[PDB]
Amino acid sequence: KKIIETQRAPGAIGPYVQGVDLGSMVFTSGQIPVCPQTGEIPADVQDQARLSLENVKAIVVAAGLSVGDIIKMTVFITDLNDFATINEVYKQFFDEHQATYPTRSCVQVARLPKDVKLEIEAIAVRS
Amino acid sequence: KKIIETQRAPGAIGPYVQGVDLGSMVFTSGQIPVCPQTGEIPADVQDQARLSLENVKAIVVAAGLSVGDIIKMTVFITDLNDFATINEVYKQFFDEHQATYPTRSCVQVARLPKDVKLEIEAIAVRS
Amino acid sequence: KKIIETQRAPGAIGPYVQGVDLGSMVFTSGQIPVCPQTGEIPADVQDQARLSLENVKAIVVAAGLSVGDIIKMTVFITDLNDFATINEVYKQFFDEHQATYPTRSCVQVARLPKDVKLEIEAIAVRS
């Protein structure tokens, strides 16, 4: 097992790491829509959805994998009224990478770190 | 990295697949109590709990595994008043398949897709 | 698979086992701050955070692993205003065991079993 560290996702500040590479599989921490260059959160849910996905991608790529290697995500959201919009961004993200859609669970939680609108964790496999 | 597709669980609404088979282990998407034939959601939570579990089972069996190969579930619910009823159905389901109980997490979320009362994801292993 | 059972973590109430050992990987059930000897839930969030973590430790140890083998934690909580206290206890727990921090997701849910303030599920790997 090996820690994943990348400047292309928000840095871990505290008692977790961005990702862990087990060889056969990679786990990410839950990624929130904080911009790694600014430490700020875009207000618009479309922009948050894209940025959470970009943060996940940065970690998977730092491990030497690709978006197409992601096989499970969990998408925690604060408002299911945002779901159709989040889904559209998510679908286009995978389509743009010519990637098969992963398995997914999606639930509306009460609140997320920094009052973001979503948090996404991923599991990828090394094929 | 084989996709699992079965008509005995609801077809994928959004950008996800029902299950993925990695060879050593199978992940399902979070299953909601939607009838795969009719698209209907049963009104009583006893019926929703059974249907969510049948939907999980369909995907696991589609991968060539059994209920007894399920090693972890997460049960997301909207009302802890439903918990005893859900636990009863869940226990009977595993017992009917002569299956040891998996590990489990259970939490009450704010809301679920299609306003269902529960969503269940699973991980199964192939020995 | 092998079931993990220890009297050092609370006994299963519902239809679940404490842990499952797959050889390369161990999964725990979501651990809540119930005292394994008395059944009591401590009132204070610092004490709940410590107890949940000890319950995770008991199961990972029963599998022949240790805290430093944990690679992912999901921390479901009822109030993000508790997070600073929870995080300090969590950091101290890993630091006391000279353990690299795992990946993590943290979200605020509506409610948890037995009205606890947090529930922590772990995944560990056998190196």
DSSP annotation string for chain A: -EEE--TTSPPP-SS--SEEE-SSEEEEPPBPS--TTTS---SSHHHHHHHHHHHHHHHHHHTT--GGGEEEEEEEES-GGGHHHHHHHHHHHHHHTT-PPPEEEEEE-SB-GGG-SEEEEEEEE--
> Are B106 and C19 within 8 A, CB to CB?
no
Phi, then psi, of B113 in degrees rounded to 5: -50, 140
**Rounded CA separation C66/A7 (Å):** 30
Residue A4's nearest CA partner among C66, A50, A12 is: A12
| Experimental method, per PDB record | X-ray
> Are A20 and C71 within 8 A, CB to CB?
yes
Cβ–Cβ under 8 Å, residues C74 and B105: yes
How many residues are given for chain B? Answer: 127
Cβ–Cβ under 8 Å, residues C36 and C67: no
Asked if A81 has any chain B CB less than 8 Å from its own CB, the reply is no
Q: CATH assignment of C1-127, given 3.30.565.10, 3.30.1330.40, 3.90.79.10, 3.40.190.10? A: 3.30.1330.40
**Rounded CA separation B62/A121 (Å):** 26
Helices (H), chain C: 45-62, 83-96
Token duo for residue A41: 């959160």
> Are C103 and A19 within 8 A, CB to CB?
yes
H or E, element range at B46? helix B45-62
Q: Which residues contact A80 (CB under 8 A, 6 or more apart)?
A: A108, B111, B112, B113
List gaps in chain A by the residue before each (C–N > 2.5 Å). Answer: none
**Rounded CA separation B71/C24 (Å):** 14
The shortest CB-CB distance from A29 to any of C87, C91, C103 is to: C103
Interface test with A, best of B29, B31, B77, B105 (most A CBs within 10 A): B29
**Rounded CA separation B49/B26 (Å):** 21
Q: Strands across the sheet with C25-28, in order?
A: C2-4, C19-21, C25-28, C118-125, C70-77, C103-108
- SS3 for C28? strand
